[PDB]
Structure formats: structure tokens, C-alpha cells
């Protein structure tokens, strides 16, 4: 049975019993906060589409107890890009899950599971592609773990090769290279190529646990026939099935639709429905009409949360007020929730909106239809905005008002000139009258005309810019008090002064000499960017209500310099076959240029001399445990007022003083387009060091980056370390026997020791022979043997593990 939507199972095992009958779960699976009140097994479950999650399921020793047959987690939708999470499983001592064969999508995260061992005894590169994104932290330190599973196969885990296993009783079963990328059954019989996980029978599409592409009537199919449609990304169904499913109850609840053969709860972005509660999306000629409406005749917005309801509306058939008294970074979120509303049928009103400095957040309003014009026929109305500086009237936007005149009052900081331009663009060029939009209190405190500073020179570096501008003399030179400079990162040219403040500040001060054009150094940048910069001049306007202006340079776009690229990330490599390597890595973190290609370099690292000298037939190990932002308020008045109280005494002195009369070479190659390169013609069992450079277009001049490195070991040559020839035996006194046998010609790295298995009737006795001992004697002597016939074998322990035993050696010891 195919379980329905996400099961959640918290507060008791006895609710876990819901998992008894269904063999496929659609959607996530949450298991939360359980506490033992017992043995439960659910061998039906095989496929979990979407993800799995467990959290504080106390008393549970291993997931192998519950889901012995979980074979696929298709991960069609992920938990913040993780297809599996096991968090604070306080009693979990092993993952188990031994039949899990493939995680199609996403990464894995296993953290704070205070007793979770068996973490690095799994070849994760054989279950999932993006091993780089995994995340394992805080678990029991694997260094104090046992990881003692029977002893099964092993694989080259990056630099190391060792056994792989899920738990103490199981190994991570994998297919052999004979089937290649195909799936396989338990007995290594290659399966049907369109098959996933284990198989009941070989090369039979009707005998599989899960189908990699799609499922239909028990038959695995790459793409199901025409008259069937994709459903939930693993199985197909007919047209009439989708019409008989009703989505979650809601005001927008409707049947499913068909698009590109896919069956979905709603049409995708870029496509919408036809109106027949159809089952056919269609092209959307441009943007698609929503038509939101509300209950009130007028939707009041008091804060971002109230505008959240408009989130995803385009055409609001109602009135609007905005009453945003306060709150931070409001406009940025009003952009998301409301900025796309593009036709308001009623009027638009703003009052007491002291949080708005710009109405840019209504990005695409291209009509106010004025069906609800106010007294005197007003349809746009702003009143008492004590911080409003810029209506949505940049050179780069137009607007139109179908009907209803405008009204503006008690806006202290709004140029009346700006509202003239606005009423020119909006088509309401001459409808208004003098009294409607007054000139007394609007913009009474705006510096509404300003002189222009000029950038005299510019100087660029990687990580620094040095810039200078001409000396600004206002009519009365004491009026200028200081300069202030703004800059931000800007990869595009659609920027303006009123974008939140996003903008940084510096506080350059008037030059202390009188023949030096001012200048600033901006330090702490990063290369290849495109920063924006403009300058303004802090000035003392008191009784200069019509005497001094401000200054404002143009937003001037400049891009720092180009560095040599930076390191390559997540360099990981494995060996699929002897004498070959496969290398995968990620782009460097900081391109410092448009990436041209990468450079890969490898050298044969020498085999350690440490391993030759020591007699491991005699040794051991142990187990154990035991520059500032002075803006503040000084700058507002405490340095403005205090320099307009020294400009008004000085004009009382001069006016009552002055009276007039009546070991191995380095290789090098170059990758072209993708982060991957299959080196060939390597040694069967050589450890390599890999240095991987990134070189941009500008690195040809500056050189290439620092090298990220990893050590990679090739798969051992199968059968190379077995004894190459027959053994020889000779008699020795004291009923002793001396054995001499040939060493292997091409051992896997080294031959560390030999093990001699021998005995008269059964080979009970075993001895360890060191490599050095063989060099001195060519073998070993067995001493004081009992009389009778004897048979023996020898085993050599190469770095890649034990070899194959020898052809049994027959010898006899006589009493005298």
C-alpha cells in the first residue's frame, strides 16, 4: 500500500504502528520526541520519496531495527538541501539502514548524535554524487569508536583504503565492476538497466524494488507511454486520475493540471490556467493576471505583516492606506510583498508614514484608476510624512492616473520641484489648482538645489582605491564644514542614492593645507568587483536658507584590480581501476577574474622508509579514554552648531574694530571546461600528491594560484601480491626444518611479513616472518619439530591486505 502524505509520529511508539501496511511513503517522514513506554519492525517500507527526519527518538539503538528494507530516498523535495537528518538521537549507536542503496538527491547531515559511531565506515561516494556537501559534526569522536565489523570488501577512500560496513553484523554490499553502472541483484547478476536497487530476478523490468526513471503497472520504464502522465516524479497515471484528486482545502482549492506531461497541483512559473477548472496550463503572454480583492473597501497597512497578505498579488481592486509609523528596513520587504501590485482601482493614501523615505517599493504601478476619488476628486493623497524625500519619479519610470487629482501636505523634505516633475509625467499636467498642492510647507527644509563636485583623479589597486576631488568654495568659505563619502558593492548600474541605507560611509575632513585637493583612501575591498562611489559636502545652513547649497558628485562606477586566482575547493579523488585516477573538485572560492581554465599537477610521492625498518611481527597499539562611525549625535549638531557660533562672534569683532576715515618528476596538464580529469598510465599501487592550480585570464601575467592538494592511492593490482612460485624445504638439526620461497616480483606497495601455516596432521602452528628476516635468510627455520609427516602453507601480508595462500608444502621430520 502507497502511504499518503507526510506522516508525523510523535509522542509514542504505538502511533508508529501506522507504518504497518504501506510499502511506499509519499512525502517527508517526521519522527519526533518519542519516549519508550519495545520491538517494532516494518519490512514493508522500501521507498521514501522526499526526505526522512528523526529527532530525540529516545531509547532507539539503531534504524536497522525499524526499516531493514529502506532501499531508496528519492529526495524529490529536500529539508534545506538535506535528504536525511538525524539530530540529537541521544541513544543511537549505529545508523544501520543496511539496504539503503541510493539517495537520488540532496546531502546528508548527522550531528550531535552523542553516541553515533560507524560514520566513516561507509563509502558515501557510492550512494550519492555530491559528497562535498555532507555535514557531520559533534558526533561521538570516531577516534574513540570501535568500527569493528566482521573480520566483505574495501575501497580507496581518498588517501586510505579500508573495509566498509553499516554495522557490526553487515557490510555495505555493492555491485562488481562487471555490471558497470547497472543495478544488480544479491548474487551479482546484472539487472535491467532501467532498474534501481536490488532485484528479484535479473534483467526483468517487472521484478524490481524501485525504478530509476518511472514506474507504471509494475513495469520500470524510462519514459512512460503517451497516454500516461508523470506523477510525483516516480510513477505515471492516466489523465482522469489527476482530475479526481482535490488539493488541500483552501480558497484556491482546485483540481490538478497537465503540462509537458507532468501532473501538478498548480501551473508552474511562466504558465497559468485556462478557466475551465481546466486541466491545461498555457503560455502567459507576459505577466499573469492575479486579481486580488479584499473584504474591507480599503486595505489599511499598519506594518509589513499586514502587507504580507498582498504577497503574491498583482491587481488590487480596492483602496489603500499606508500608516507605517516606524520599523526598520520596511521598504525592502514591502518590495517583496506589495511591489508587484500594478493596478489599484481605488485611491492611494499615505499618512503618518514616518518610516518611508521613498515610494520606490511600489516598483511597477502603471495605473491608479480612481474609481473612488475623494473630496475635490482626489485619488492620490499623502499627508504628514515627516521623512518622505523621493516619490517614484526617477528619469527611468513613467506613471498614469486615469482620474482624480493629487494632494500633498506637511511633507517637510520634498522638493516642490520634484512634485512638479511628477505631475508633468503622470499626465495630470494642468488639472490641479494652486491650493491643492501647496508651496508653503512642502519641502520647506530640502536642499533643493546643489552644486556639483568634480572627481579630479582616481587611483585603483587590488584591495584599495585612492580618489580626489576639486576644492569646493561656497560663497562664504566658513559654511563648508566637512566632506562625507558613500560607497557600496554594485555589480550592475541600476543604483540610486535612496536604496535603503546598503551604502557605507566614510568621514574625510577638509584639507589642512590650502594647496592640496582633498582625497580619500577606501581600504578593505576585494578584486574584480564594481563598486559605486559618490561624494556630498556637510555644510552649515543657518540663515543660508537661500545663501548656500549642498554638493553631490555623480554615482561613478569603478572596478578594483585582478588577483591570481585563489585555491581549488573540495579536491576529492578516487581510483576506479589500477593505473588510473579520477579527480573531482569545486571552483575556487574567489575567481579574481573570469575563469579561463584550471591546471592539474601530480607527482609520485615516495613510499615511506618508516615501514621498512620495524618488525611488526613484534609490536602493538592502545585503546583509551579520559576608522569609526562618529556620526552618533556629535556630528548632527555638536559640530554644526559649534561652528556657527564662531562665525557670528567673528562677525562682531571685525565690525567693531575696522573703522574707515570719513625523487620523481612532476607532470602537468590543463583542464578545459569542467572540474574532472581521468589521469592514465599510473603505477598500480603508488601514492600520489596532487597540486591543482586555478589560472584566470589575468593569471597569465600574475601567475597561478596556490595549490590545494590531496593524496590519492590507486586500487591494488589484484593477484599481484600472491606468491609467484613454489616453496622449497630443507632439513635442519634438532628436528628442524628450513623453508625458502620466492618473494613476489611486483608487490602491492610492499611485502611486510609472511605467515607460515604448518602442522603434522592439522596445521595448528602459525609463525610470523618479517621482511627483514627473509632478506637475511631467504626464509625461516622451524625448530624442534615432532617426528612425522608435515604439510604447510605460507601467506604474505602486503600493504593492500593478505594475499592468496600457497600451494601446500609437503615435508617430513625424522626423529633421528
Amino acid at each position: 500500500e502507497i502511504c499518503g502524505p507526510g506522516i508525523d509520529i510523535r509522542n509514542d511508539y504505538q502511533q508508529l504502528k501506522r507504518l504497518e501496511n504501506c510499502t511506499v511513503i509519499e512525502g517527508y517522514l517526521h519522527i519526533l520526541l518519542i519516549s519508550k513506554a519495545r520491538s517494532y519492525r516494518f519490512p514493508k517500507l522500501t521507498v521514501i520519496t522526499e526526505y526522512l527526519l528523526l529527532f530525540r527518538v529516545a531509547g532507539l539503538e539503531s534504524l536497522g531495527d525499524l526499516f531493514p528494507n529502506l532501499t531508496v530516498i528519492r529526495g524529490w523535495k529536500l529539508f534545506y538541501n538535506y535528504a536525511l537528518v538525524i539530530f540529537e538521537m541521544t541513544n543511537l549507536k549505529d545508523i544501520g539502514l543496511y539496504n539503503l542503496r541510493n539517495i537520488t538527491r540532496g546531502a546528508i547531515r548527522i550531528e550531535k548524535n552523542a553516541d553515533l559511531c560507524y560514520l566513516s565506515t561507509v563509502d558515501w561516494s557510492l550512494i550519492l554524487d555530491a559528497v562535498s556537501n555532507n555535514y557531520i559534526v559533534g558526533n561521538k569522536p570516531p577516534k574513540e569508536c570501535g568500527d569493528l565489523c566482521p573480520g566483505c570488501e574495501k575501497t580507496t577512500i581518498n588517501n586510505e583504503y579500508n573495509y566498509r560496513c553499516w554495522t557490526t553484523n553487515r557490510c555495505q554490499k555493492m555491485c562488481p565492476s562487471t555490471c558497470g553502472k547497472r543495478a544488480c541483484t544479491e548474487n551479482n547478476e546484472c539487472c535491467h538497466p532501467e532498474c534501481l536497487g536490488s532485484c528479484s530476478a535479473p534483467d526483468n523490468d517487472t521484478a524490481c524494488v524501485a525504478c530509476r526513471h518511472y514506474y507504471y503497472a509494475g513495469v520500470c520504464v524510462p519514459a512512460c507511454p503517451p497516454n500516461t502522465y508523470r506523477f510525483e516524479g516516480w510513477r505515471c497515471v492516466d489523465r482522469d486520475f489527476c482530475a479526481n484528486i482535490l488539493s488541500a482545502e483552501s480558497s484556491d482549492s482546485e483540481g490538478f493540471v497537465i503540462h509537458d506531461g507532468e501532473c501538478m497541483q498548480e501551473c508552474p512559473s511562466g504558465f497559468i490556467r485556462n478557466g475551465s477548472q481546466s486541466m491545461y496550463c498555457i503560455p502567459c503572454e507576459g505577466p499573469c493576471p492575479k486579481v486580488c480583492e479584499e473584504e474591507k473597501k480599503t486595505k489599511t497597512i499598519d506594518s509589513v505583516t499586514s502587507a504580507q497578505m498582498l504577497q503574491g498579488c498583482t491587481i488590487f481592486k480596492g483602496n489603500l492606506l499606508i500608516n507605517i509609523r516606524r520599523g526598520n528596513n520596511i521598504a525592502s520587504e514591502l518590495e517583496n510583498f506589495m511591489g508587484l501590485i500594478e493596478v489599484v482601482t481605488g485611491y492611494v493614501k499615505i499618512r503618518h508614514s514616518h518610516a518611508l523615505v521613498s515610494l520606490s517599493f511600489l516598483k511597477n504601478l502603471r495605473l491608479i484608476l480612481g474609481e473612488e476619488q475623494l473630496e475635490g476628486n482626489y485619488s492620490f493623497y499623502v499627508l504628514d510624512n515627516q521623512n518622505l524625500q523621493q516619490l517614484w519619479d526617477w528619469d527611468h519610470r513613467n506613471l498614469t492616473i486615469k482620474a482624480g487629482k493629487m494632494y500633498f501636505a506637511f511633507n517637510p523634505k520634498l522638493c516642490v520641484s520634484e512634485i512638479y516633475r511628477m505631475e508633468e509625467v503622470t499626465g495630470t499636467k494642468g488639472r490641479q489648482s494652486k491650493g491643492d498642492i501647496n508651496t508653503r510647507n512642502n519641502g520647506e527644509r530640502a536642499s533643493c538645489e546643489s552644486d556639483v563636485l568634480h572627481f579630479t583623479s582616481t587611483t585603483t589597486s587590488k584591495n584599495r582605491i585612492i580618489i580626489t576631488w576639486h576644492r569646493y568654495r561656497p560663497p562664504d568659505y566658513r559654511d563648508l564644514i566637512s566632506f562625507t563619502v558613500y560607497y557600496k558593492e554594485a555589480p550592475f548600474k541600476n543604483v540610486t542614492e535612496y536604496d535603503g541605507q546598503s551604502w557605507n560611509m566614510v568621514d574625510v575632513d577638509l584639507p589642512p593645507n590650502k594647496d592640496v585637493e582633498p582625497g580619500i583612501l577606501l581600504h578593505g575591498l576585494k578584486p574584480w568587483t564594481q563598486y559605486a562611489v559618490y561624494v556630498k559636502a556637510v555644510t552649515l545652513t543657518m540663515v543660508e536658507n537661500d545663501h548656500i547649497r549642498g554638493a553631490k558628485s555623480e554615482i561613478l562606477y569603478i572596478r578594483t584590480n585582478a588577483s591570481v586566482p585563489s585555491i581549488p575547493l573540495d579536491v576529492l579523488s578516487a581510483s576506479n581501476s589500477s593505473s588510473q585516477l579520477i579527480v573531482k573538485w569545486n571552483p575556487p572560492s574567489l575567481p579574481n577574474g573570469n575563469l579561463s581554465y584550471y591546471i592539474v599537477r601530480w607527482q609520485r610521492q615516495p613510499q615511506d622508509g618508516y615501514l621498512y625498518r620495524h618488525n611488526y611481527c613484534s609490536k602493538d597499539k592502545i585503546p583509551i579514554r579520559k576608522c569609526a562611525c562618529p556620526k552618533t549625535e556629535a556630528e548632527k549638531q555638536a559640530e554644526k552648531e559649534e561652528a556657527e557660533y564662531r562665525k557670528v562672534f567673528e562677525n562682531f569683532l571685525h565690525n567693531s574694530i575696522f573703522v574707515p576715515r570719513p625523487e620523481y618528476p612532476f607532470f602537468e596538464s590543463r583542464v578545459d571546461n569542467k572540474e574532472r580529469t581521468v589521469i592514465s598510465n599510473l603505477r598500480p599501487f603508488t601514492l600520489y600528491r596532487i597540486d591543482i592550480h586555478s589560472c584566470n585570464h589575468e593569471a597569465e601575467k600574475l601567475g597561478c594560484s596556490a595549490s590545494n592538494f590531496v593524496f590519492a592511492r590507486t586500487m591494488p593490482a589484484e593477484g599481484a601480491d600472491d606468491i609467484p612460485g613454489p616453496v622449497t624445504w630443507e632439513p635442519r638439526p634438532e628436528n628442524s626444518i628450513f623453508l625458502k620461497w620466492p618473494e613476489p616480483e611486483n608487490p602491492n606497495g610492499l611485502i611486510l611479513m609472511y605467515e607460515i601455516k604448518y602442522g603434522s596432521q592439522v596445521e595448528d602452528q602459525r609463525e610470523c616472518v618479517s621482511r627483514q628476516e627473509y632478506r637475511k635468510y631467504g626464509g625461516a627455520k622451524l625448530n624442534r619439530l615432532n617426528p612425522g609427516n608435515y604439510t604447510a602453507r605460507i601467506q604474505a601480508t602486503s600493504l593492500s591486505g593478505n594475499g592468496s595462500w600457497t600451494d601446500p608444502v609437503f615435508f617430513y621430520v625424522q626423529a633421528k
Binding site: 562664504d476 562677525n651 571685525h654 565690525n655 575696522f658 573703522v659 574707515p660 576715515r661
Partner: peptide, 21 residues
């Protein structure tokens, strides 16, 4: 005051020989 001559208008020399040497 002298400022009203010089800090508001311009003061040529003819406006300043009055109290020079």
C-alpha cells in the same frame, strides 16, 4: 560694517584705500 561691504558684495581697492598707508 566692513563685512556687509566685503562678505556680501565685493570690495575693490577703491573701497579699501581709506585706512591703508
Amino acid at each position: 560694517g566692513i563685512v556687509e561691504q566685503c562678505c556680501t558684495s565685493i570690495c575693490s581697492l577703491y573701497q579699501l584705500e581709506n585706512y591703508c598707508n
